[PDB]
Amino acid sequence: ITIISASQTGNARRVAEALRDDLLAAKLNVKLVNAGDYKFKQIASEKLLIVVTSTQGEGEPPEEAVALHKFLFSKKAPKLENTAFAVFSLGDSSYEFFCQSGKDFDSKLAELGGERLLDRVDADVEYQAAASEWRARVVDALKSRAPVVATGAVNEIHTSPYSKDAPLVASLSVNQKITGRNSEKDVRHIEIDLGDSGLRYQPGDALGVWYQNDPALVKELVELLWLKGDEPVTVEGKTLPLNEALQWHFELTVNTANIVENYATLTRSETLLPLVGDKAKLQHYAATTPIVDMVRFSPAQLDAEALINLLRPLTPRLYSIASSQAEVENEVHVTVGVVRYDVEGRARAGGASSFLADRVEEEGEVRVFIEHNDNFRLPANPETPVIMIGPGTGIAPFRAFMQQRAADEAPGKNWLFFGNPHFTEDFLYQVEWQRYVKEGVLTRIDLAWSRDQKEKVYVQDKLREQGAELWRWINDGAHIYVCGDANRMAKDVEQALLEVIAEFGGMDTEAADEFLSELRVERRYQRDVY
Ligand SMILES: Cc1cc2nc3c(=O)[nH]c(=O)nc-3n(C[C@H](O)[C@H](O)[C@H](O)COP(=O)(O)OP(=O)(O)OC[C@H]3O[C@@H](n4cnc5c(N)ncnc54)[C@H](O)[C@@H]3O)c2cc1C
Numbered sequence: 218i219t220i221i222s223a224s225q226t227g228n229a230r231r232v233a234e235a236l237r238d239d240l241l242a243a244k245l246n247v248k249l250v251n252a253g254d255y256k257f258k259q260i261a262s263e264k265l266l267i268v269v270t271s272t273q274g275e276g277e278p279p280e281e282a283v284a285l286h287k288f289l290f291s292k293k294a295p296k297l298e299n300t301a302f303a304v305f306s307l308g309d310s311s312y313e314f315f316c317q318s319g320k321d322f323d324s325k326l327a328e329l330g331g332e333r334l335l336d337r338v339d340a341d342v343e344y345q346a347a348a349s350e351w352r353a354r355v356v357d358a359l360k361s362r363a364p365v366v367a368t369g370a371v372n373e374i375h376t377s378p379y380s381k382d383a384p385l386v387a388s389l390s391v392n393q394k395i396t397g398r399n400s401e402k403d404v405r406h407i408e409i410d411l412g413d414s415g416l417r418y419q420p421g422d423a424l425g426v427w428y429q430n431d432p433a434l435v436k437e438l439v440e441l442l443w444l445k446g447d448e449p450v451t452v453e454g455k456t457l458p459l460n461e462a463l464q465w466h467f468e469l470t471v472n473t474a475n476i477v478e479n480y481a482t483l484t485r486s487e488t489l490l491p492l493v494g495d496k497a498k499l500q501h502y503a504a505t506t507p508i509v510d511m512v513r514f515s516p517a518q519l520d521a522e523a524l525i526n527l528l529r530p531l532t533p534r535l536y537s538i539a540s541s542q543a544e545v546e547n548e549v550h551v552t553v554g555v556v557r558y559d560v561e562g563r564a565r566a567g568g569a570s571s572f573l574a575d576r577v578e579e580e581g582e583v584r585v586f587i588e589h590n591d592n593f594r595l596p597a598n599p600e601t602p603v604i605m606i607g608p609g610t611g612i613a614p615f616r617a618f619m620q621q622r623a624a625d626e627a628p629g630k631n632w633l634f635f636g637n638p639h640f641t642e643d644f645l646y647q648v649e650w651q652r653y654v655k656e657g658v659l660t661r662i663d664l665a666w667s668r669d670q671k672e673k674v675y676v677q678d679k680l681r682e683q684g685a686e687l688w689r690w691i692n693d694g695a696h697i698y699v700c701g702d703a704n705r706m707a708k709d710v711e712q713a714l715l716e717v718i719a720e721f722g723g724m725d726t727e728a729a730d731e732f733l734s735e736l737r738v739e740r741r742y743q744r745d746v747y
């Protein structure tokens with residue numbers, strides 16, 4: 218933000234100073250320069266340019282602004298592309314040309330391509346009236362609602378005031394374990410109350426969930442480094458106790474090759490030095506050793522700033538939305554697989570998933586936003602058939618699909634392929650599926666239980682078993698959806714779809730692949746895999 222003051226007896230400067238003190242209290246973009254010193258030749262690169270000028274000699278500018286005026290009214294003045302500006306004008310009404318100077322600058326700057334931030338404002342002798350409120354909306358219009366440099370806070374969600382950087386403060390209503398006692402996995406059905414926010418979402422969207430690290434994990438980490446936890450550290454320019462920085466502001470539950478390498482170097486660890494510069498060794502160590510355990514295994518003294526400088530900022534996690542608002546109204550449901558594992562007998566857990574499962578009380582606060590996915594959507598035609606492939610937690614959006622199609626009483630046929638280790642332990646939402654089958658909403662359902670018999674069975678095996686009927690549905694205009702594990706499931710499922718298409722469509726592998734690519738183009742093959 219560049220405030221140019223053009224003044225003869227200092228009134229315009231008093232205003233422009235009154236504006237340097239406002240912006241100074243708001244944004245970090247404020248610099249006050251006199252017109253007589255302003256290097257106008259480089260003006261095009263002004264991101265935010267506010268002019269405060271009085272008027273002299275029948276509309277003549279103040280003396281100090283005369284060169285700047287001639288250079289803007291000159292045949293050689295620069296066109297402006299990324300310049301936002303405003304103009305406040307001072308003068309005396311009794312004169313023929315009231316506020317010529319301020320008028321000139323306002324007209325000419327926009328005529329060079331400058332983005333008019335506010336409408337120009339004039340004022341007579343008694344100017345602390347018009348000036349006191351102009352200075353007001355400028356600070357607002359020059360806040361995040363029209364930024365350039367300092368503080369932006371820009372996000373994207375339908376027409377909402379809520380976004381990833383300004384999330385909704387919601388509350389946790391339901392937190393329920395939906396895998397059986399003998400499951401190898403902890404899966405939670407989560408209902409979050411949206412209150413009166415008006416936050417909206419469609420099936421296929423995901424929920425962005427901010428979280429905090431486990432205070433126990435922060436404490437274990439802080440101790441192993443021989444810190445106590447109240448050491449001050451700088452986080453985004455402000456000063457926090459270490460514990461608060463670690464709990465709220467940095468990733469602790471994900472290790473990376475870079476972190477291993479940096480930590481090896483900082484500590485000269487004999488265990489870790491040998492991995493330095495070997496990307497595959499570093500990645501493998503990160504993947505098997507959480508940060509807190511890397512520290513255990515390679516003790517070293519680090520001060521608080523050295524630790525926090527090691528870490529990446531904390532980021533929210535996404536969770537496919539498992540409800541339809543037509544059915545649940547001012548709520549959002551998710552299906553959370555809690556990452557739980559052990560390192561030499563010490564319990565470890567993913568940050569967000571264990572935050573929701575273990576560290577938020579009923580009615581407890583949860584900060585959320587919507588991640589819109591326009592490329593994962595039910596057909597617009599309520600009669601088009603729908604094929605859904607979502608084993609594990611990939612089941613979530615298909616709960617939302619069926620809540621929606623049932624709410625709309627869509628007559629389209631629906632087909633679910635689901636899979637997990639055990640029928641008696643891992644049939645997520647079994648009793649709802651039975652109800653959908655009973656009610657005629659869920660037309661077909663095929664299940665793959667990978668650990669209920671000797672040989673492994675997965676959804677791709679049921680896709681192959683169902684080849685003939687799948688191809689029939691595909692020729693009836695069916696949309697195919699795949700949600701869940703990217704690394705293995707989505708690939709094996711795509712391979713099985715290609716085999717079905719090749720076989721029952723009578724084409725070779727390259728033709729099947731082009732056919733599936735045509736379904737993508739047609740938005741009839743959509744995936745949300747992660
Ligand atoms: C579009 C989208 C939709 C999603 N939908 C869902 C959904 O419906 N349900 C769902 O549950 N998730 C879903 N996810 C995944 C979700 O966003 C998270 O990534 C997941 O919950 C893990 O995050 P976390 O914070 O719990 O764990 P993190 O702390 O981020 O990650 C866990 C870490 O632990 C490590 N780790 C795991 N096991 C071991 C081990 N044995 N030894 C050493 N290290 C280990 C991993 O390497 C990883 O570094 C979705 C993701 C996307 C992008």
Ligand SMILES: Cc1cc2nc3c(=O)[nH]c(=O)nc-3n(C[C@H](O)[C@H](O)[C@H](O)COP(=O)(O)O)c2cc1C
Binds near residue numbers: 227309
């Ligand atoms: C000699 C003189 C000529 C002026 N001519 C004009 C004029 O032509 N048009 C106008 O609107 N104001 C005119 N003014 C009014 C001044 O611009 C007004 O007093 C203003 O507040 C000056 O503020 P400053 O202290 O920043 O110079 C004139 C003032 C003086 C002293």
